[PDB]
Amino acid sequence: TTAAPLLALLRENQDSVKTYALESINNVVDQLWSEISNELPDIEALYDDDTFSDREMAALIASKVYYNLGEYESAVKYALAAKDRFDIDEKSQFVETIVSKSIEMYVQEASKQYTKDEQFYTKDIIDPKLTSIFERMIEKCLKASELKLALGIALEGYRLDIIESALKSKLDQSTSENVKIINYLLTLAITTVTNSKFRSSILRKSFDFLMNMPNCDYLTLNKVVVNLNDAGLALQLFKKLKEENDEGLSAQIAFDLVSSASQQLLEILVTELTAQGYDPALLNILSGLPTCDYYNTFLLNNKNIDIGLLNKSKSSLDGKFSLFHTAVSVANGFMHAGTTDNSFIKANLPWLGKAQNWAKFTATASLGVIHKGNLLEGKKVMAPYLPGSRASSRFIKGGSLYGLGLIYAGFGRDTTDYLKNIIVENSGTSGDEDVDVLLHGASLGIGLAAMGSANIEVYEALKEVLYNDSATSGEAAALGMGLCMLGTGKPEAIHDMFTYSQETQHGNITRGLAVGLALINYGRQELADDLITKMLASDESLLRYGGAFTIALAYAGTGNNSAVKRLLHVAVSDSNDDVRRAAVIALGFVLLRDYTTVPRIVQLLSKSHNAHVRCGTAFALGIACAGKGLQSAIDVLDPLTKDPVDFVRQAAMIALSMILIQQTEKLNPQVADINKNFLSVITNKHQEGLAKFGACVAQGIMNAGGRNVTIQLENADTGTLDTKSVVGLVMFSQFWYWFPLAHFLSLSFTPTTVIGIRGSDQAIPKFQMNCYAKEDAFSYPRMKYSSKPYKVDNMTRILPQQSRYISFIKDDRFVPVRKFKGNNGVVVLRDREPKEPVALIETVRQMKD
């Protein structure tokens, strides 16, 4: 009917009468809101009246009317003023709307307030009314018991204390379920929280909850440690693992930490366990040696290689041309990587001889890739070419120090000392060409050996090389300084490096330091944003080049929108062709975790008229889609292999080979045509020099490590990013500017196998596991699920796609310490019948003694 009779009562003097009127109107407000709006000033007058008892009801009615009107900022103001009389349980559009809007406002408020104070929630800083709705919305979720929404909101609003309490009250004390929750809350914090100081706090709190649980999940506890990169947490991890003592577990855990975790953390953790007189068996695994040993043995024994491919490359591309020499020199090292077998070069010695200048540098250092790992005899192999070896040229002698760092990468503590001495000795000398080429090789190698070390004495040593401002040595020193300081965001270093990139008179050096600055910010995310802006703003294209890479690293693996947009802008709007290429490539890193979106995001760019942009998108795809076999990426790349521009055809093929590594005609029918094409390009005399070098190098990648490696930037188990492989790929992307840098791709090669280990003696038993799949499927090239499994031997090639199908045999002598994850690496076995004899696999190190 009409609300006028009710509205009239608002004028009555007694509160009991106005209150009755308000509550009556409330019932009909949804029909009569138009009629009622006319009286709003009266209704608000009631709210503004300090002595009216039911003002909260006045507000509530105002709110409902503004809402029904479509003035929302007003409806919120009043619902908030309503306080309690606003009922979040009521199921209605009104309530959904103002609750959504209130949450938005509180998060906005809380972001701003958190950066000023992380305890902000304990102060009155935020509006108590707004706070109330937020917290009550939380309460509602926990009463209905959806804790995954309750946690999300609390997360979104920077409230760690709510998350903490919520977990206490919601932990049963079915621990397996608890762990699932902490895992969801971790995944959320890593993949959404954009504030570091915050994201850290959650992991640190998630750690203490996992630590206190009676049943302990170390698999999850490992995730937290690697993510935070915190040696103190690792230490606690083991001290708790000691008091549980089950030796098999402690071993498995150490094998896990050795694969996923960072080098500098492993070093700090052994030194402390060592000094605390920890078990010598564990201290051995945590040195990395055993694992390096198992992978070495694996690559030596299972190596499958088609040598004709290299041979066609040598016969078609003449080694007198420094390009064609580099092309095969590199492809050699790739196929033979880590495998230790030098057969090809021994066979064509004369071919090696035609290499001149820097092509000589590359061929020497290629021994380093073939010998990657091989810590035992590694230094010996290089002796003939070492300095003072009676070597013929500073190319052989300089590339030797680079082949050396390649071998010992990640183990280089000994090698670092060796190389550091050469630098300090020869940094003083200037004007000598022989010392310059030497100081180049020293710096590339020392960078690989000191990588991630944050070691100030090597940084300082290298810094002296840079000041000689030799164009020859300068680039290496800068890269070295980046590799050395990688991920530190060390402000001293950034400052020193930036200032000098302007003062120097050499371009390559300014390009060296641009990348160097990218390395130092690797992983830093938002803390890199100030430096990124300076760099992108610079007039010097080379620094803008570094700007793109600094985003690629700092934001690597994050799907960050600001950063994806900022790079799309640089790609489209930048004046410089190299800078536009670098900005597209950086997309591959930023998006490596969401790699399926990558082909659509760059599809248009692949059609661009600018060839540098077209070429950068082959690489964005190569990088982001590396381990994966993704078809949508291949479809985008297919046309680019037929591109008019040579270096676009080149990047397209190289990228295809990284996307397709280990794939075979049986898995993907298209791979036959792709392989065939790599060949036609190499054979044809009319095909451009650059297309060929790219096809040749592509074969090396496709077939790398005797078919037993893959490229994966993100660790399958921890979800963490593999630093070594990222850096591998970011240097590889510099090859256009410096060819020797190509070998850096070797850091991205990881062996694909499941390796059983007997926990007690750390010995490798020969047994068989079940693989539910068709046998023909995962076989090497001639050169999915199956109900009936087939048997696969321990320590043999297991493709990443294939891991899901592998199963340990239920009744068998060997049973895994913890349940099988379903993916590659070392798995620690328990022996049911220790007395009985088993055939054992001899470690290469073992034969020596």
XYZ file of N, CA, C and O in Angstrom, residues 418-547:
520
model
N 91.272 -21.628 -6.534
C 92.230 -21.710 -7.622
C 92.105 -20.517 -8.549
O 93.088 -19.846 -8.857
N 90.878 -20.268 -8.989
C 90.614 -19.251 -9.985
C 90.789 -17.858 -9.402
O 91.277 -16.952 -10.077
N 90.408 -17.699 -8.139
C 90.518 -16.409 -7.463
C 91.964 -15.948 -7.415
O 92.244 -14.755 -7.484
N 92.884 -16.897 -7.303
C 94.299 -16.558 -7.263
C 94.806 -16.023 -8.601
O 95.590 -15.081 -8.640
N 94.344 -16.609 -9.697
C 94.750 -16.140 -11.014
C 94.262 -14.732 -11.263
O 94.962 -13.922 -11.872
N 93.057 -14.438 -10.795
C 92.511 -13.109 -11.000
C 93.338 -12.073 -10.253
O 93.774 -11.083 -10.839
N 93.580 -12.306 -8.971
C 94.308 -11.327 -8.173
C 95.732 -11.113 -8.696
O 96.263 -10.000 -8.640
N 96.339 -12.171 -9.222
C 97.688 -12.071 -9.762
C 97.710 -11.219 -11.025
O 98.551 -10.333 -11.179
N 96.772 -11.488 -11.924
C 96.767 -10.841 -13.228
C 95.853 -9.631 -13.390
O 95.759 -9.065 -14.479
N 95.180 -9.235 -12.314
C 94.306 -8.070 -12.373
C 95.140 -6.796 -12.488
O 94.727 -5.826 -13.124
N 96.321 -6.815 -11.875
C 97.217 -5.674 -11.900
C 97.694 -5.321 -13.294
O 97.730 -4.149 -13.665
N 98.057 -6.338 -14.070
C 98.590 -6.126 -15.414
C 97.558 -5.588 -16.409
O 96.386 -5.958 -16.373
N 98.019 -4.711 -17.299
C 97.162 -4.064 -18.290
C 97.878 -3.931 -19.631
O 99.105 -3.871 -19.683
N 97.109 -3.889 -20.714
C 97.678 -3.736 -22.041
C 98.142 -5.037 -22.668
O 98.621 -5.053 -23.806
N 98.001 -6.131 -21.927
C 98.382 -7.444 -22.428
C 97.162 -8.220 -22.929
O 96.225 -8.456 -22.174
N 97.182 -8.610 -24.202
C 96.098 -9.393 -24.802
C 95.955 -10.813 -24.216
O 94.846 -11.322 -24.064
N 97.076 -11.451 -23.895
C 97.052 -12.804 -23.348
C 96.400 -12.858 -21.968
O 95.706 -13.822 -21.648
N 96.632 -11.827 -21.157
C 96.091 -11.760 -19.799
C 94.608 -11.420 -19.841
O 93.829 -11.829 -18.975
N 94.222 -10.666 -20.861
C 92.832 -10.291 -21.036
C 91.979 -11.513 -21.381
O 90.970 -11.758 -20.727
N 92.377 -12.288 -22.387
C 91.628 -13.503 -22.705
C 91.637 -14.461 -21.514
O 90.656 -15.149 -21.247
N 92.747 -14.501 -20.794
C 92.806 -15.327 -19.608
C 91.782 -14.790 -18.615
O 90.947 -15.538 -18.115
N 91.820 -13.492 -18.344
C 90.900 -12.926 -17.354
C 89.419 -13.019 -17.756
O 88.523 -12.829 -16.930
N 89.165 -13.297 -19.027
C 87.807 -13.530 -19.478
C 87.374 -14.884 -18.959
O 86.402 -14.998 -18.212
N 88.150 -15.902 -19.327
C 87.861 -17.272 -18.959
C 87.809 -17.429 -17.456
O 86.981 -18.163 -16.928
N 88.693 -16.726 -16.764
C 88.724 -16.785 -15.314
C 87.396 -16.313 -14.752
O 86.868 -16.888 -13.802
N 86.855 -15.259 -15.347
C 85.672 -14.628 -14.793
C 84.400 -15.421 -15.083
O 83.567 -15.579 -14.194
N 84.249 -15.934 -16.305
C 83.137 -16.847 -16.598
C 83.167 -18.064 -15.653
O 82.171 -18.381 -14.992
N 84.318 -18.737 -15.592
C 84.498 -19.892 -14.734
C 84.293 -19.590 -13.255
O 83.567 -20.309 -12.561
N 84.933 -18.533 -12.761
C 84.842 -18.177 -11.349
C 83.401 -17.836 -10.978
O 82.971 -18.034 -9.836
N 82.662 -17.314 -11.956
C 81.253 -17.020 -11.784
C 80.438 -18.284 -11.595
O 79.561 -18.342 -10.741
N 80.724 -19.302 -12.398
C 80.066 -20.590 -12.248
C 80.430 -21.259 -10.913
O 79.601 -21.910 -10.278
N 81.670 -21.076 -10.482
C 82.153 -21.719 -9.271
C 81.697 -21.002 -8.022
O 81.429 -21.634 -7.006
N 81.643 -19.677 -8.092
C 81.232 -18.845 -6.956
C 79.749 -18.500 -6.992
O 79.280 -17.696 -6.198
N 79.028 -19.092 -7.937
C 77.639 -18.744 -8.173
C 76.832 -18.825 -6.895
O 76.856 -19.839 -6.213
N 76.123 -17.740 -6.588
C 75.226 -17.670 -5.449
C 75.939 -17.534 -4.123
O 75.313 -17.545 -3.073
N 77.259 -17.400 -4.168
C 78.064 -17.490 -2.955
C 77.954 -16.231 -2.126
O 78.149 -16.255 -0.919
N 77.641 -15.126 -2.779
C 77.567 -13.854 -2.082
C 78.898 -13.604 -1.387
O 78.962 -12.902 -0.375
N 79.958 -14.169 -1.958
C 81.289 -14.100 -1.372
C 81.959 -12.788 -1.748
O 82.218 -12.539 -2.919
N 82.256 -11.964 -0.745
C 82.761 -10.612 -0.988
C 84.196 -10.563 -1.525
O 84.566 -9.622 -2.226
N 85.002 -11.572 -1.209
C 86.388 -11.581 -1.673
C 86.508 -11.865 -3.174
O 87.401 -11.333 -3.834
N 85.623 -12.703 -3.712
C 85.599 -12.947 -5.156
C 84.986 -11.760 -5.889
O 85.476 -11.344 -6.940
N 83.910 -11.220 -5.322
C 83.283 -10.014 -5.842
C 84.308 -8.900 -5.951
O 84.396 -8.224 -6.975
N 85.072 -8.707 -4.880
C 86.109 -7.679 -4.843
C 87.216 -7.963 -5.853
O 87.722 -7.054 -6.517
N 87.588 -9.235 -5.965
C 88.627 -9.657 -6.894
C 88.197 -9.348 -8.318
O 88.943 -8.753 -9.097
N 86.978 -9.763 -8.641
C 86.400 -9.520 -9.950
C 86.284 -8.038 -10.224
O 86.510 -7.595 -11.348
N 85.919 -7.273 -9.200
C 85.681 -5.845 -9.395
C 86.925 -5.163 -9.944
O 86.829 -4.179 -10.675
N 88.092 -5.704 -9.599
C 89.356 -5.135 -10.052
C 89.575 -5.374 -11.544
O 90.210 -4.569 -12.229
N 89.048 -6.488 -12.041
C 89.182 -6.835 -13.448
C 88.379 -5.864 -14.283
O 88.769 -5.490 -15.392
N 87.234 -5.481 -13.740
C 86.279 -4.648 -14.446
C 86.856 -3.262 -14.700
O 86.626 -2.674 -15.755
N 87.618 -2.757 -13.733
C 88.187 -1.414 -13.803
C 89.298 -1.248 -14.839
O 89.563 -0.131 -15.281
N 89.953 -2.340 -15.219
C 90.950 -2.278 -16.284
C 90.264 -1.797 -17.546
O 90.903 -1.297 -18.477
N 88.946 -1.956 -17.564
C 88.131 -1.484 -18.667
C 88.695 -1.994 -19.983
O 88.761 -1.264 -20.974
N 89.127 -3.249 -19.974
C 89.466 -3.930 -21.209
C 88.155 -4.414 -21.775
O 87.365 -5.018 -21.059
N 87.900 -4.137 -23.048
C 86.664 -4.604 -23.656
C 86.635 -6.129 -23.621
O 85.589 -6.740 -23.399
N 87.795 -6.742 -23.820
C 87.882 -8.200 -23.829
C 87.492 -8.865 -22.497
O 86.636 -9.746 -22.469
N 88.112 -8.444 -21.401
C 87.817 -9.033 -20.102
C 86.527 -8.504 -19.441
O 85.843 -9.233 -18.714
N 86.201 -7.242 -19.694
C 85.159 -6.555 -18.951
C 83.814 -7.258 -18.865
O 83.184 -7.269 -17.801
N 83.359 -7.838 -19.975
C 82.029 -8.441 -19.993
C 81.972 -9.622 -19.031
O 81.053 -9.737 -18.217
N 82.976 -10.485 -19.117
C 83.074 -11.638 -18.236
C 83.016 -11.238 -16.765
O 82.208 -11.769 -16.008
N 83.866 -10.298 -16.366
C 83.905 -9.833 -14.978
C 82.544 -9.383 -14.467
O 82.165 -9.677 -13.332
N 81.815 -8.658 -15.307
C 80.486 -8.187 -14.947
C 79.515 -9.347 -14.730
O 78.798 -9.380 -13.730
N 79.485 -10.285 -15.675
C 78.665 -11.477 -15.537
C 79.089 -12.245 -14.277
O 78.257 -12.658 -13.468
N 80.392 -12.421 -14.109
C 80.916 -13.070 -12.928
C 80.381 -12.437 -11.660
O 79.956 -13.128 -10.737
N 80.407 -11.112 -11.614
C 79.944 -10.379 -10.442
C 78.466 -10.609 -10.166
O 78.037 -10.577 -9.013
N 77.697 -10.821 -11.232
C 76.274 -11.097 -11.125
C 76.023 -12.499 -10.605
O 75.240 -12.715 -9.678
N 76.704 -13.463 -11.209
C 76.608 -14.849 -10.778
C 77.041 -14.986 -9.334
O 76.388 -15.665 -8.543
N 78.136 -14.322 -8.989
C 78.613 -14.328 -7.615
C 77.588 -13.759 -6.639
O 77.347 -14.341 -5.583
N 76.974 -12.634 -6.995
C 76.042 -11.945 -6.087
C 74.582 -12.349 -6.299
O 73.676 -11.765 -5.697
N 74.365 -13.365 -7.126
C 73.035 -13.705 -7.593
C 72.034 -13.780 -6.453
O 72.232 -14.504 -5.478
N 70.939 -13.038 -6.610
C 69.812 -13.063 -5.688
C 69.933 -12.231 -4.414
O 68.984 -12.156 -3.627
N 71.087 -11.603 -4.207
C 71.355 -10.889 -2.962
C 70.646 -9.553 -2.881
O 70.399 -9.040 -1.788
N 70.339 -8.981 -4.044
C 69.775 -7.648 -4.108
C 70.706 -6.715 -3.358
O 70.296 -5.636 -2.915
N 71.966 -7.136 -3.224
C 72.929 -6.415 -2.403
C 73.100 -5.004 -2.935
O 73.572 -4.801 -4.056
N 72.734 -4.021 -2.103
C 72.598 -2.619 -2.503
C 73.947 -1.998 -2.831
O 74.030 -1.152 -3.723
N 74.990 -2.413 -2.117
C 76.333 -1.966 -2.443
C 76.587 -2.334 -3.888
O 76.923 -1.482 -4.695
N 76.389 -3.611 -4.200
C 76.694 -4.173 -5.514
C 75.918 -3.506 -6.641
O 76.485 -3.087 -7.651
N 74.611 -3.425 -6.473
C 73.779 -2.729 -7.430
C 74.319 -1.330 -7.735
O 74.471 -0.956 -8.899
N 74.608 -0.570 -6.678
C 75.094 0.808 -6.805
C 76.414 0.855 -7.579
O 76.536 1.578 -8.555
N 77.388 0.062 -7.156
C 78.691 0.035 -7.812
C 78.554 -0.278 -9.294
O 79.261 0.285 -10.134
N 77.658 -1.210 -9.597
C 77.558 -1.771 -10.937
C 76.870 -0.803 -11.891
O 77.316 -0.608 -13.027
N 75.783 -0.203 -11.413
C 75.027 0.795 -12.164
C 75.878 2.013 -12.504
O 75.938 2.422 -13.659
N 76.534 2.593 -11.498
C 77.368 3.774 -11.721
C 78.402 3.502 -12.800
O 78.641 4.337 -13.667
N 79.009 2.327 -12.754
C 80.091 2.053 -13.675
C 79.618 1.812 -15.100
O 80.353 2.080 -16.047
N 78.404 1.306 -15.271
C 77.937 1.009 -16.619
C 77.871 2.258 -17.490
O 77.898 2.163 -18.713
N 77.750 3.420 -16.849
C 77.755 4.714 -17.542
C 79.154 5.279 -17.827
O 79.397 5.840 -18.898
N 80.059 5.117 -16.859
C 81.435 5.623 -16.943
C 82.284 4.918 -17.992
O 83.136 5.533 -18.632
N 82.069 3.619 -18.143
C 82.837 2.816 -19.085
C 82.649 3.315 -20.513
O 81.634 3.946 -20.839
N 83.653 3.078 -21.349
C 83.547 3.423 -22.756
C 83.170 2.263 -23.671
O 83.164 2.408 -24.894
N 82.886 1.104 -23.088
C 82.551 -0.064 -23.894
C 81.101 -0.504 -23.764
O 80.556 -0.569 -22.666
N 80.488 -0.811 -24.904
C 79.110 -1.260 -24.936
C 78.903 -2.636 -24.332
O 78.077 -2.804 -23.436
N 79.663 -3.618 -24.812
C 79.537 -4.983 -24.321
C 79.620 -5.034 -22.803
O 78.918 -5.816 -22.159
N 80.468 -4.186 -22.233
C 80.630 -4.122 -20.787
C 79.390 -3.555 -20.113
O 78.996 -3.974 -19.017
N 78.787 -2.571 -20.760
C 77.565 -2.002 -20.236
C 76.439 -3.025 -20.376
O 75.543 -3.079 -19.540
N 76.496 -3.849 -21.420
C 75.553 -4.955 -21.557
C 75.839 -6.054 -20.518
O 74.923 -6.689 -19.994
N 77.113 -6.265 -20.209
C 77.494 -7.249 -19.213
C 76.928 -6.896 -17.854
O 76.360 -7.737 -17.160
N 77.070 -5.633 -17.480
C 76.608 -5.167 -16.184
C 75.083 -5.032 -16.094
O 74.501 -5.009 -15.001
N 74.431 -4.913 -17.242
C 72.985 -4.829 -17.242
C 72.475 -6.176 -16.799
O 71.714 -6.270 -15.846
N 72.928 -7.224 -17.478
C 72.602 -8.584 -17.075
C 73.057 -8.850 -15.643
O 72.294 -9.371 -14.831
N 74.292 -8.462 -15.335
C 74.821 -8.586 -13.987
C 73.885 -8.056 -12.914
O 73.757 -8.645 -11.832
N 73.227 -6.940 -13.213
C 72.270 -6.328 -12.296
C 70.989 -7.143 -12.216
O 70.294 -7.112 -11.200
N 70.685 -7.870 -13.291
C 69.497 -8.710 -13.347
C 69.714 -9.883 -12.424
O 68.868 -10.197 -11.592
N 70.874 -10.514 -12.569
C 71.273 -11.621 -11.712
C 71.183 -11.249 -10.234
O 70.566 -11.963 -9.451
N 71.785 -10.126 -9.856
C 71.756 -9.696 -8.460
C 70.349 -9.489 -7.917
O 70.138 -9.547 -6.711
N 69.388 -9.219 -8.788
C 68.004 -9.062 -8.328
C 67.148 -10.311 -8.509
O 65.944 -10.302 -8.236
N 67.778 -11.388 -8.966
C 67.042 -12.604 -9.240
C 66.207 -12.910 -8.018
O 66.718 -12.915 -6.910
N 64.915 -13.140 -8.214
C 64.037 -13.557 -7.129
C 63.448 -12.479 -6.233
O 62.467 -12.731 -5.552
N 64.027 -11.280 -6.257
C 63.680 -10.193 -5.329
C 62.270 -9.590 -5.454
O 61.779 -8.923 -4.537
N 61.637 -9.815 -6.597
C 60.301 -9.309 -6.836
C 60.230 -7.806 -6.582
O 61.055 -7.040 -7.087
N 59.261 -7.401 -5.766
C 58.923 -5.998 -5.585
C 60.059 -5.143 -5.027
O 60.041 -3.929 -5.164
N 61.045 -5.763 -4.398
C 62.156 -5.007 -3.823
C 63.108 -4.566 -4.917
O 64.060 -3.813 -4.666
N 62.861 -5.059 -6.125
C 63.671 -4.689 -7.280
C 63.060 -3.518 -8.056
O 63.698 -2.937 -8.936
N 61.828 -3.158 -7.702
C 61.052 -2.201 -8.475
C 61.660 -0.814 -8.602
O 61.470 -0.149 -9.611
N 62.397 -0.366 -7.599
C 63.065 0.925 -7.719
C 64.172 0.908 -8.776
O 64.216 1.763 -9.643
N 65.043 -0.085 -8.723
C 66.090 -0.237 -9.727
C 65.530 -0.468 -11.123
O 66.106 -0.018 -12.121
N 64.413 -1.184 -11.196
C 63.809 -1.481 -12.485
C 63.369 -0.193 -13.146
O 63.595 0.008 -14.335
N 62.754 0.696 -12.375
C 62.293 1.959 -12.940
C 63.432 2.837 -13.456
O 63.316 3.415 -14.529
N 64.520 2.945 -12.700
C 65.686 3.697 -13.159
C 66.157 3.139 -14.483
O 66.498 3.882 -15.391
N 66.189 1.815 -14.584
C 66.805 1.174 -15.742
C 65.939 1.316 -16.981
O 66.432 1.568 -18.085
N 64.642 1.137 -16.797
C 63.731 1.228 -17.918
C 63.626 2.667 -18.420
O 63.359 2.912 -19.604
N 63.853 3.606 -17.500
C 63.770 5.036 -17.778
C 65.026 5.578 -18.460
O 65.001 6.649 -19.045
N 66.121 4.835 -18.389
C 67.396 5.319 -18.901
C 67.346 5.560 -20.389
O 66.625 4.876 -21.100
N 68.135 6.526 -20.851
C 68.225 6.839 -22.276
C 69.045 5.796 -23.019
O 68.863 5.575 -24.222
N 69.939 5.148 -22.283
C 70.824 4.157 -22.858
C 70.069 2.849 -23.095
O 69.591 2.218 -22.150
N 69.987 2.426 -24.356
C 69.207 1.245 -24.694
C 69.720 0.036 -23.913
O 68.943 -0.688 -23.294
N 71.035 -0.158 -23.922
C 71.647 -1.246 -23.175
C 71.156 -1.360 -21.734
O 70.959 -2.468 -21.236
N 70.957 -0.240 -21.052
C 70.424 -0.314 -19.694
C 68.952 -0.718 -19.665
O 68.521 -1.462 -18.779
N 68.182 -0.206 -20.623
C 66.806 -0.653 -20.818
C 66.790 -2.165 -21.156
O 65.865 -2.879 -20.780
N 67.822 -2.646 -21.855
C 68.000 -4.079 -22.094
C 68.073 -4.812 -20.755
O 67.355 -5.786 -20.523
N 68.937 -4.320 -19.875
C 69.074 -4.868 -18.542
C 67.794 -4.757 -17.741
O 67.494 -5.606 -16.887
N 67.035 -3.702 -18.017
C 65.767 -3.494 -17.356
C 64.820 -4.652 -17.600
O 64.207 -5.150 -16.665
